[PDB]
């Protein structure tokens, strides 16, 4: 069965740092962007919404504006990595990386942000 | 945006009763099974896993074996209803109906089971 795996399910990060949460799914040979959906969420906040090759950044939650991106260079290797720059306390919570790619799976990642 | 809607996000049911949890998604004309993934879970228990029409009884969580199924009579109407027979206390929790169908969405539904 199509499996999403997270190499780390717990991130403990310093205030103001840059953080990359990895999220892996299998790709045989070539990645078919047209078949891929990548969704990143935290307490119902829309962080990343990659739908069949297209990203609507208008729907991203304001609290993540200019700080959260999906690293496309990784995607091609089956890593739907979320990078957050300038991490804030408002970023702490349970993240879910959800993938649809001929099959579907998701995993949780807890991020704890240390006090300044 | 592709939207999964739930006509009810809270069910309050009697112990030992039958329960249908509705979950609706848009269907334009004919249903394309090869494009449909429906998944129902609660507390990481795999309840329904319908992948392009394919289901595997072996992956269904044992506490729901023989009691839970996906209502197929109205998948063509866009209702991926989860039916549970002989509701038990351990059926109380937060359910997710996750649907991929030319796009992807999911909704949470809370079930509270009244004591007998
Ligand atoms: C979780 O185990 C599973 N899971 C499954 O299928 C699951 C996996 C994930 C997903 C998605 C999905 C995928 C990608 C993205 C999204 C998504 O885009 N979400 C989203 C998007 C937007 C919004 C906000 N709203 C926007 C609009 C506007 C207004 C409104 O109301 N909506 C909310 N949410 C979804 C949903 C879609 C169907 C189903 C599913 C399946 C087959 C099997 C399993 C079993 N695993 C076990 C395996 C073996 C061992 C192991 O480690 N793994």
Resolution number, Å: 2.2
Distance separating alpha carbons of residues B57 and A109, to the nearest angstrom:
28
> Hey, whose CA ends up nearest to atom 1 of ligand 1?
A105
**Mutate which: B100, B102, B107, vs A, most A CBs within 10 A:** B100
Q: A48: which strand partners?
A: A40
Residue A100 has its nearest CB partner, among B37, B49, B59, at: B37
Q: Which helix (DSSP H) or strand (DSSP E) does residue B89 occupy? A: none
Q: How far is CA A104 from CA A13, B37, B114, in A?
A: 29, 8, 33
**Mutate which: A39, A40, A100, vs B, most B CBs within 10 A:** A100
3-class secondary-structure state, position B94? strand
Distance separating alpha carbons of residues A74 and A71, to the nearest angstrom:
6
Distance separating alpha carbons of residues B88 and B15, to the nearest angstrom:
6
What is the number of other CB atoms lying within 10 angstroms of the CB of residue B40?
Answer: 27
Q: Sign of the CA dihedral A82, B107, B81, A108? A: positive
Q: Are B104 and A1 in contact (CB < 8 Å)?
A: no
Residues of A in contact with B2 (CB under 8 A): 51
Q: B17: which strand partners?
A: none
What is the number of other CB atoms lying within 10 angstroms of the CB of residue B64?
Answer: 21
For chain B, domains (ranges, CATH) are: 1-116 (2.60.40.10)
Distance separating alpha carbons of residues B61 and A53, to the nearest angstrom:
34
CA distance A15 to chain B (A): 31
3-class secondary-structure state, position A82? strand
CA distance A91 to chain B (A): 22
């Amino acid at each position: 069965a199509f499996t999403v795996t997270v190499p780390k399910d717990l991130y403990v990060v310093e205030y103001g740092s840059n953080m990359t949460i990895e999220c892996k799914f299998p790709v045989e040979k070539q990645l078919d962007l047209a078949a891929l959906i990548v969704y990143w969420e935290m307490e119902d906040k829309n962080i990343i919404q990659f739908v069949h090759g297209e990203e609507d950044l208008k729907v991203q939650h304001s609290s993540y504006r200019q700080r959260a991106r999906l690293l496309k260079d990784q995607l091609s290797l089956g890593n739907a990595a979320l990078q957050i720059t300038d991490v804030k306390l408002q970023d702490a919570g349970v993240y879910r990386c959800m993938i649809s790619y001929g099959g579907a799976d998701y995993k949780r990642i807890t991020v704890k942000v240390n006090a300044p």
